[model samples]
Target: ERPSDLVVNRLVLFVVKGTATSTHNTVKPLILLEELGVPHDIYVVEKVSAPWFSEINPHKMVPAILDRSPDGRDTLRAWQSTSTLMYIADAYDKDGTFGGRNVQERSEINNWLTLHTAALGPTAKYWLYFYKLHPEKLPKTIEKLRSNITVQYDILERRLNEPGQQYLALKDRPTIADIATLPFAMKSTAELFGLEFEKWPKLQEWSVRMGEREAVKRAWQRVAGFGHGEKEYGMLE
Candidate 1:
């Protein structure tokens, strides 16, 4: 049976279960949902178990979603943080404000999205694992992860510093690319990894700017309200 809280009445139901400390991946789609003003419900569970959640997301991870049809005849399931972002944008963002407006823009957005998934996301994950979560304290592994993270940050720094570019994929506005990267690039993530954005001035400024958005502010508040407070490395995994 589905979780008792799985409400079929809503247009979308967001299922999130993360480490008590951090649900950063889950927040990505939440931010987009807020930006798109989609009518949805957030179901914060203590843990992601089978067979109900597994049927929805076989990987059984946080940040999976259920999209219900108006007739209650169908429910579409989407998992993986970036995949969830794309699904939400495609379904709700009719004007393509954050998804993309044209083929070229969409392709560019995909490029940056892939960059995050392939490089920054994995690197940051390992950085956190080595720097904070790991019990044994492997100095060399930590340093290697840190260096990889720095390279990713420098790439973002250069992209943001490029002439006539403000956001990652688009010049004028934020897109899924920005949304996907922000949680990883946030100051909190940096602090947890024991690094600073001193050298990447543009990236630092961009993070500040993204954090100030009204939607992002609301998303952060709502996510935090689910009892996940700002503890040490709270949002890493």
Candidate 2:
């Protein structure tokens, strides 16, 4: 691979460092950036709520992008991680296959994307928070989150079991939907959380399938330290 020049007048991704297994760098965006081979600089933000970062997003979140591709002040800047992923696909994934091949594919992609956003991401996030960050390890709350995550995983299990749905969105190839959902179970986290992988057979199969991909290895390589610390997240090796 050729090392490209560090071009500042291009796309820039803002991410965070891992504090533990939580508040980590934006996994989805970093993965997509490598998966798409888009050239961009990563700005590691220490004070996410500081004026400099908050000026870009009032919500004060990691995983924002400044796309100076367009002219003048019309540059496309997005804060939400998935939205940034979607924009990067639309703007740079000229093949139209990964972003969406047609209206039907895009609609299906949107369906799964919303599922990840509304159910899968939040459920797992809260589960991790209660398990790792709660002042008291609330067993009841943890169990509730565990049950909720099972619901989300069960939905994905059934979807992956559908005929012709090897990946999410019922596609033969991966799309943004797959990238968005895979992290919930990547790196053996579900098993570490004490969730039985056998309970969600198809989803378990999907995770392994996605993990073994070359692009996944490449993506994970770029952001290993952002998730499970420097020495651990690269377990894929």
Candidate 3:
């Protein structure tokens, strides 16, 4: 029961139950909440309708958040990890480094964010589901997911290959754009697909660079919990 005295002074991040250590959906927001330095609490919960939780997210999805304020009435609810990332960057990143410095930079970040939301993230998820999590383990479906991910990675590779590009948004610093896609894109399971990280050299480097960040490492620890080795690179080049 939600106590009448329950008070929220910061964000409440809800992670998918039993998947705190590995889910891409959970990983993304976990990284952002840390990277952006938002004061928040992580709540691992079942993806089902409940009282306080479901009231915050009608979809009953993992990765939902309750943004608290000093004034209780101003509390806001957010769902979908990507959108929550944008919110954290906008609201918490006081220096605007992780978000953007201006409109143009923000737009570039938005482009990559869209790419991750539409192509990279979903493709990698379906690929993992069919290849690793699915009950039937259909080869044809798995290959299709793999092919889709390859296409998305090909696009990202080309973008990262552009001269002077370091991060996914072609920025000198990392943004939520990098945070949004890093989990699955850099998952160690790509070796199972026979993908050569050497081919996507720029992206491979970017993945390592992202992983090496203090904020990212801290976030990885928070979500991965103790006892699991850290995951920084999707593929070790």
Candidate 4:
């Protein structure tokens, strides 16, 4: 596609009911939007009366962004939170900024992305399931993984403290790696594990600011978080 023909129609549409799996997935793409300074919209997947969401998501998943090119073309949809966010960062970015300009830079971000999806995300799921959702499923194994989760959190802290790079791109700027991983880390530590990321000053600051972003707040209005019944998952009363 020619430069003129390659129009950018980036409208980030999310359909989720509270912090259910959707919010857990959207953090990176929203960050990409902010870092790239891209324009988008927030579609709250409501479950009030009508509009059964299952019909919308055949597999019952959230698509990161619903795209239509600026060239007045047909619709193109991308889902799988990480995949969608990566597509935007790589394809839509006007400059070599959020995604990365060079191979090394992209590789570094990709490494972190893999770390988050493979390690942290899975560990978190197991932790949550074993502890709260399905203790009966595998009582002993989930208990064992608890230590691993704590260790992963520590690894993130150490990475945040590493010097010379304020953000993940190995530059002074923030890259897709930071964007992709921050939400899972921040939400896991803060919401589920009852671990506040107060230390790792840079990471804490980044998460706090990102939490206050327009997209974050707006997404909240839609999801509203585990719906105020967190302690049911096993917490101190």
Candidate 5:
């Protein structure tokens, strides 16, 4: 009993199942979307196989965006997380403040963004994933996580909680980096993973504060529906 005319909606659509790892890396676009506060569509890409998915998403990724043209042209699908972020930054931001229009600040953003994925991100994810999912295969993974994960988290912890006050993300005007890391930190569930945020007090407080925002909570609730995945840091100095 499918409706033949079920094709009226044509806003910018983001196809993502709203899973754990996706929440980590793809928080960028979601933050941007929420910031824009536009009425857009989010289609959950189920773990099931479709007949023509590969053709739609060139990279076979969760977060492929389809921009609908008013004139009824073919849907413009921009694939990949980074490119999608750029598209949003360009299309929505009239002031051009978020993504630096200048050379140096843009370089900083790109450099740190690369570091987040290549170094901090991969290490934190692998440390937690192999520890949680493949526990039997690698019993000593706690040692690994404690070493690499805690080190990184503590560095951020010190930065954010230096004066026993507001965090780095909340320190003045929140930047693209703040938007980037907020969800990645929020995605962790201490209860399920037998991990305690007490060890990372600043991080815990920051996450809870960010969760107070309705949009952040909505995106988080979306992922909690899917189930899944936190942090490095020591006591303040």
Candidate 6:
């Protein structure tokens, strides 16, 4: 028998396509859930723009979650990659390991987390679009995006190079900030955009270190199996 206060609702994580090559937004939450040992079910949203999916996230984005109350009375719907990370950390991380131990730490963690969501993630996404996805091959837009991405990497590189700062927000362990940023900094993502980390060695090293964690490894493996042997969705054309 479980305690009265113990809520064991298995969360439902919504992903864009059923395939292994889902976006990084989908992978971010998976990493955090794995780290916290949270029980969750992956739901593939083959048609993200469908009316039904809009109820979950009106923005029609991947990585939304439906967290039902233990009694199955109330359900919390959350969207966005960073928002999902924070929600999971707040509800599941009892010891505040990844969330933060206190006010100061939590504030610091938010600082880096905001930077990733506001700067790094968007810049990288745009870079990918203009650099590769866009058919027109707009050189001006691509150059600007590339420059912004470099600045973001430089900021992270400097942070990691700081004395006693192994992780982004905290000195000792990985936090939501790191988890939120790792997918964007991943080797494949970087390569996809024709970007390299040779100029930002520390940031590259940090990416490798974060990827080596067991939880991150498990998350990637699990995400790869999404929609396996299932119907393929329409690709962005």
Model 5, C-alpha of 108: deviation from truth (Å): 4.6
| Model 5 agreement with the true structure over 75-106: per-residue lDDT tens digits | 66666555566666666666545555567656
Per-residue alpha-carbon lDDT of candidate 6 for residues 1-237, written as tens digits (9 for 90 to 100) = 312222325787877554524667888888989998997867766777777678778888888888886567888877999999988987788999999999999998999999999999888778867766788989998888888887888889889899998899999999999999998776777776677867778888888999899999998876776766353432111
**Which stretch of 10 consecutive residues in model 4 shows the poorest summed lDDT?**
228-237
Evaluate model 6: give its TM-score.
0.88
Model 3 TM-score, all chains together: 0.83
Model 2 lDDT per residue over 1-237, tens place: 111321246777766665435333377777777778887766555566677567676789877887775554665677876788788888888886668878988899889988988887888778888887888889898899899887888788888888878988855888888888888855476775788777887888888898887777776665545434433321112
Candidate maximizing lDDT? 6
Candidate 4 TM-score over all chains jointly:
0.70
Of candidate 6, the 10-residue stretch with the lowest lDDT total is: 228-237
lDDT of 6: 0.80
Can you rank all candidates by lDDT, best first? 6, 1, 2, 3, 4, 5
Q: Per-residue lDDT tens digits of candidate 1, residues 77-165?
A: 77989999988987888989999999999998999999999998988888778767888888899889888888889889889989988
Better of 1 and 4 by TM-score: 1
lDDT of each: 0.79, 0.73, 0.72, 0.60, 0.55, 0.80
Better of 1 and 2 by TM-score: 1
TM-score of every candidate relative to the true structure: 0.88, 0.84, 0.83, 0.70, 0.66, 0.88
Per-candidate alpha-carbon RMSD to the true structure: 4.5, 5.8, 6.1, 8.8, 9.0, 6.0
Clashing residue pairs for model 2: none
Cα deviation of 230 in candidate 3 (Å)? 21
Pull out the clashing pairs in model 5: 153-232, 153-233, 154-232, 154-233, 188-229
Tell me the tens digit of each residue's lDDT in model 4 across 102-173.
888888878877777788778876887777787377767875676676677677667767876566545476
